[PDB]
Amino acid sequence: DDKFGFIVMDGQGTLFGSVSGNTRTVLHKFTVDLPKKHGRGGQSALRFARLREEKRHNYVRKVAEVAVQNFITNDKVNVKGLILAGSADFKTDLAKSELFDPRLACKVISIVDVSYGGENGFNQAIELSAEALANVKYVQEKKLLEAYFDEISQDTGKFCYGIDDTLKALDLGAVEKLIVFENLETIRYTFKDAEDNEVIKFAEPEAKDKSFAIDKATGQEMDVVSEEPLIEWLAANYKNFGATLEFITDKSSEGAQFVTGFGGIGAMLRYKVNFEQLVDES
Amino acid sequence: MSDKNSRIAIVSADKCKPKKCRQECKRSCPVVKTGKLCIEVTPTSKIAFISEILCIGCGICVKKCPFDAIQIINLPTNLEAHVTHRYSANSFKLHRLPTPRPGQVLGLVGTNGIGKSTALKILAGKQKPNLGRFDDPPEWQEIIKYFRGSELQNYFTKMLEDDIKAIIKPQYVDNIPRAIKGPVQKVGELLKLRMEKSPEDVKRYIKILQLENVLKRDIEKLSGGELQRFAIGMSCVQEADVYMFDEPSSYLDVKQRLNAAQIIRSLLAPTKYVICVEHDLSVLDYLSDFVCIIYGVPSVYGVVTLPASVREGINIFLDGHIPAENLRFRTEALQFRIADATEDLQNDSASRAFSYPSLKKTQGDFVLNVEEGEFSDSEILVMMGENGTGKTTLIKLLAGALKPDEGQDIPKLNVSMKPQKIAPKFPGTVRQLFFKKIRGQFLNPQFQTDVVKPLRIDDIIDQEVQHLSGGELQRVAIVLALGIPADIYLIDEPSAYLDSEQRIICSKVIRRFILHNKKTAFIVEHDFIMATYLADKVIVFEGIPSKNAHARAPESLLTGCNRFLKNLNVTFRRDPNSFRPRINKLDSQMDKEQKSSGNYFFLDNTGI
Ligand SMILES: Nc1ncnc2c1ncn2[C@@H]1O[C@H](COP(=O)(O)OP(=O)(O)OP(=O)(O)O)[C@@H](O)[C@H]1O
Ligand SMILES: Nc1ncnc2c1ncn2[C@@H]1O[C@H](COP(=O)(O)OP(=O)(O)O)[C@@H](O)[C@H]1O
Ligand code: SF4
Ligand code: SF4
């Protein structure tokens, strides 16, 4: 499950929280004070005011450090993005300062206004942020996908497609990254005997497929004994093949390309290969 | 709603050998992986076939192909609307046709492979369009239906009835000599038989065409220019309503092409329908009332536009873009160097280069006279004039191929030479021939841009020269002259057999190398545009063809162009948008003024 953490701030107060599906709960909150010295003040039009942008810089790194020190254990960010919120400039004074921690400015994923803060502004920051969330999701999937893939298949043939191809090369450890989908249409079936078996790849439409199932010599029509999902079998044995996994659906530009071609499927290689073999050849 | 798109696959069988990589197209293709039909293998012919319905448009197969045999393109369904004819599966398909009109001349212009020739056949009744389908031997009834909504519909009804039989002047210029012979049945015999018009018709047509000398010669004997004109004569002589000309400017010289254009236009006066196809813009403008532009990739497709006017069609042609079609038909726009654009250098002056004295070469039938001129280093000189003037003779003398009757030219210079008419006469393949000349030049990037990439010589490399084509062979010859180092290079009429893009590649080639290398070049030409780009000086030839001739010393671009154009008496203005030369009519309004100023051309162009 998939974990996102955010920091919603104002001077009235500040607030930290997350969602993970239906789940929802805050973590911590605090306040400081300050009228707004750029009026009354005096011969000290900077004396008093410089304590107060300092107390914002104390506040916003004490906010963002606590978000780091309990969202992350085991380097960088354990969550996979960050959001900021507040009235107009009070959050632009964060994202462009010497006093928001270096490497944390590199991880903002949205910046939202909310008409009011606290728990009433937190629902508003989930609700209007939905757009930002969708955007991020797209950027991740579609893009990255559509991009890398084509952008650099891995010329000559540093690729396979199909179950037949994508599996031998995954067994060979020649596939850096295996590309599946979710609704895989291919699974591992066993059609076998008293001391031996065959494994074939089947989908839905059973024409010639059911036909074979055997070879030739022994002459035996068929009997299925068991059926193991390839997507799952792969989804669970990816470490063994050393191939690296990405599941995907259908939503985005070059998205439609996978359905027509790389139909929940595709292997990307580490080095460069010799493509599958078989036997039906002479 | 959704964007409308299609996929079209055209495969060249010449490029394909499915033993070499096995059948790599069927494998590889993701459609077939699933068990679909996108590519089916033809077992008898042993050719891959790609079905347009099942193909994804992935293009995976294209980059797999080890040669480059397959091409998949995606169009917005621009071609689908227009389908006229298709040669076969995965082959050239024609789109739209040119309108014919009585009492007028309709022009056609396009790059080679567009179907200009095919269109003529369909109008001729020679070929029956299949309509991108089954349509059999002339099932003309269906053709009318397809043409409905177009003005050709009436024409196709006429053709089927056989009310009119069109007269065609054949396209392929190389093919004619082998087909027709008549040492006995020379040109004269043909003109006598065909003359349905009058006995005057024989005389009048011969005089205007400058055929007088050629009647006695046989057809096979004729030179290219002479061969063309005889065909023209028969197309006036015939009695009919429709006279189709297909590329009448080919092989002809500058003076003669204009002459042909005028005579052909005479047909319009008798209210006879005329159609014409041209590669030359000067000629095209002169003949036509209406103009069609044919565009699209060569050998893949070619569509005809709606009819336009003479000025408008030419203007649109030069921009390289058509708005309704919204296609950039040409990758780069054509421009000519201003002469402001050229580099400023001090040239070898003094004894810049070598000089030739008065020269004479006399056959005993023709006499050439040459005036002493000078050549300098790093410059180039254009040679212009009508054929039979000894333009060819002069170059040979400088080559050392010919010995002067009088005068002498013994230079201690290395010369490279490119001949005028190219006929194979070489055993061996294309690559081998290039390689003997120079291997290094084949490596250079410039040669990749101009020769190798455009034509795809790689496919040509194995093919024989006898087996080759005309225009393809021309670019190869020009490049080969450039293959070897020489103090002076000599080229004779590079524009032959070439379309617009092809010539222009040549223009850039001669100018650029000569400048970089700092060597001299002489180029003979009929195409006004080519001369302007390359040269710095010009030699104009005058006299009477097939009789005597004369040459002049080299003179500046402005000076030489005035002389040449004064001989023709046609001035050119400028079109303000396209910047092309606008044919100004004699007695143009402008013609008179331009003649007074002594300006035949505007926006004079020189070497880059
Ligand atoms: N017998 C044939 N089989 C298949 N395709 C053909 C055949 N004859 C011609 N074509 C196709 O039709 C197109 C060619 O010819 P057409 O003769 O119609 O050209 P044009 O338009 O007159 O061009 P060019 O200026 O090069 O003479 C070509 O690009 C070619 O692919
Ligand atoms: N060997 C020859 N004997 C007689 N006449 C010739 C010979 N070679 C060329 N001619 C004639 O010389 C004239 C001009 O020839 P050429 O220099 O080839 O002309 P162009 O200006 O077309 O290049 C033509 O009329 C041609 O028939
Ligand atoms: S087209 Fe190319 S890849 Fe396909 S059979 Fe021929 S040579 Fe092999
Ligand atoms: S372009 Fe693509 S889809 Fe068409 S034949 Fe080649 S690989 Fe198959």
PDB file of C-alpha atoms in Angstrom, chain A residues 145 148-149 159-166 178-187 201-205 230-231 234 245-250 254-268, chain B residues 28-36 56 58 60:
ATOM      1  CA  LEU A 145       6.518   4.045 -19.360  1.00  0.00           C
ATOM      2  CA  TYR A 148      11.804   4.768 -21.479  1.00  0.00           C
ATOM      3  CA  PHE A 149      10.154   1.944 -23.416  1.00  0.00           C
ATOM      4  CA  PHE A 159      14.024  -7.228 -26.005  1.00  0.00           C
ATOM      5  CA  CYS A 160      11.534  -9.922 -26.033  1.00  0.00           C
ATOM      6  CA  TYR A 161       7.731  -9.996 -26.210  1.00  0.00           C
ATOM      7  CA  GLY A 162       5.199 -12.736 -25.627  1.00  0.00           C
ATOM      8  CA  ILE A 163       5.231 -15.291 -22.824  1.00  0.00           C
ATOM      9  CA  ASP A 164       7.482 -17.692 -24.755  1.00  0.00           C
ATOM     10  CA  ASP A 165      10.118 -15.079 -25.408  1.00  0.00           C
ATOM     11  CA  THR A 166       9.776 -12.936 -22.244  1.00  0.00           C
ATOM     12  CA  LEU A 178      10.118  -7.319 -17.011  1.00  0.00           C
ATOM     13  CA  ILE A 179       7.028  -5.583 -18.296  1.00  0.00           C
ATOM     14  CA  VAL A 180       3.710  -7.154 -17.498  1.00  0.00           C
ATOM     15  CA  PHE A 181       0.369  -5.328 -16.766  1.00  0.00           C
ATOM     16  CA  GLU A 182      -2.155  -6.514 -14.177  1.00  0.00           C
ATOM     17  CA  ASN A 183      -4.871  -8.255 -16.141  1.00  0.00           C
ATOM     18  CA  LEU A 184      -2.376 -10.637 -17.739  1.00  0.00           C
ATOM     19  CA  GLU A 185      -4.099 -12.983 -20.189  1.00  0.00           C
ATOM     20  CA  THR A 186      -1.456 -15.700 -20.035  1.00  0.00           C
ATOM     21  CA  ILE A 187      -1.009 -18.278 -17.289  1.00  0.00           C
ATOM     22  CA  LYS A 201       0.763 -20.864 -22.321  1.00  0.00           C
ATOM     23  CA  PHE A 202      -2.970 -20.333 -22.798  1.00  0.00           C
ATOM     24  CA  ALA A 203      -5.337 -17.368 -22.910  1.00  0.00           C
ATOM     25  CA  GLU A 204      -9.103 -17.263 -23.425  1.00  0.00           C
ATOM     26  CA  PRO A 205     -10.050 -18.077 -27.027  1.00  0.00           C
ATOM     27  CA  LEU A 230       1.871 -16.286 -14.922  1.00  0.00           C
ATOM     28  CA  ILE A 231       1.254 -12.752 -13.790  1.00  0.00           C
ATOM     29  CA  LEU A 234       6.052 -13.772 -12.035  1.00  0.00           C
ATOM     30  CA  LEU A 245       8.685  -5.267 -11.895  1.00  0.00           C
ATOM     31  CA  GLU A 246       6.156  -2.886 -13.098  1.00  0.00           C
ATOM     32  CA  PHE A 247       2.485  -3.633 -13.472  1.00  0.00           C
ATOM     33  CA  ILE A 248       0.387  -1.299 -15.603  1.00  0.00           C
ATOM     34  CA  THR A 249      -3.240  -0.818 -16.994  1.00  0.00           C
ATOM     35  CA  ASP A 250      -4.543   1.180 -19.956  1.00  0.00           C
ATOM     36  CA  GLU A 254       1.518   5.355 -26.086  1.00  0.00           C
ATOM     37  CA  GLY A 255      -0.623   3.397 -23.455  1.00  0.00           C
ATOM     38  CA  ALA A 256      -2.877   2.110 -26.329  1.00  0.00           C
ATOM     39  CA  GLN A 257       0.319   0.803 -27.956  1.00  0.00           C
ATOM     40  CA  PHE A 258       0.756  -1.876 -25.265  1.00  0.00           C
ATOM     41  CA  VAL A 259      -2.772  -3.217 -25.676  1.00  0.00           C
ATOM     42  CA  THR A 260      -2.386  -3.521 -29.448  1.00  0.00           C
ATOM     43  CA  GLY A 261       1.170  -4.786 -29.038  1.00  0.00           C
ATOM     44  CA  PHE A 262       2.763  -5.405 -25.699  1.00  0.00           C
ATOM     45  CA  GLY A 263      -0.385  -6.716 -24.229  1.00  0.00           C
ATOM     46  CA  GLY A 264       0.406  -6.594 -20.677  1.00  0.00           C
ATOM     47  CA  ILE A 265       3.729  -7.924 -21.569  1.00  0.00           C
ATOM     48  CA  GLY A 266       7.327  -7.127 -22.545  1.00  0.00           C
ATOM     49  CA  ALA A 267      10.871  -7.914 -21.366  1.00  0.00           C
ATOM     50  CA  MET A 268      13.714  -5.322 -21.443  1.00  0.00           C
TER      51      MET A 268
ATOM     52  CA  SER B  28       8.846  -9.523 -34.880  1.00  0.00           C
ATOM     53  CA  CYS B  29       5.375  -8.133 -35.686  1.00  0.00           C
ATOM     54  CA  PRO B  30       3.373  -7.870 -32.506  1.00  0.00           C
ATOM     55  CA  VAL B  31       0.080  -8.354 -34.308  1.00  0.00           C
ATOM     56  CA  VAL B  32       1.170 -11.784 -35.531  1.00  0.00           C
ATOM     57  CA  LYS B  33       2.482 -12.621 -32.103  1.00  0.00           C
ATOM     58  CA  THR B  34      -1.080 -12.443 -30.846  1.00  0.00           C
ATOM     59  CA  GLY B  35      -2.182 -14.577 -33.752  1.00  0.00           C
ATOM     60  CA  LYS B  36      -3.456 -11.787 -35.973  1.00  0.00           C
ATOM     61  CA  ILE B  56      -0.884  -1.414 -35.681  1.00  0.00           C
ATOM     62  CA  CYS B  58       3.947   0.326 -34.723  1.00  0.00           C
ATOM     63  CA  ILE B  60       8.605  -2.212 -35.419  1.00  0.00           C
TER      64      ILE B  60
END
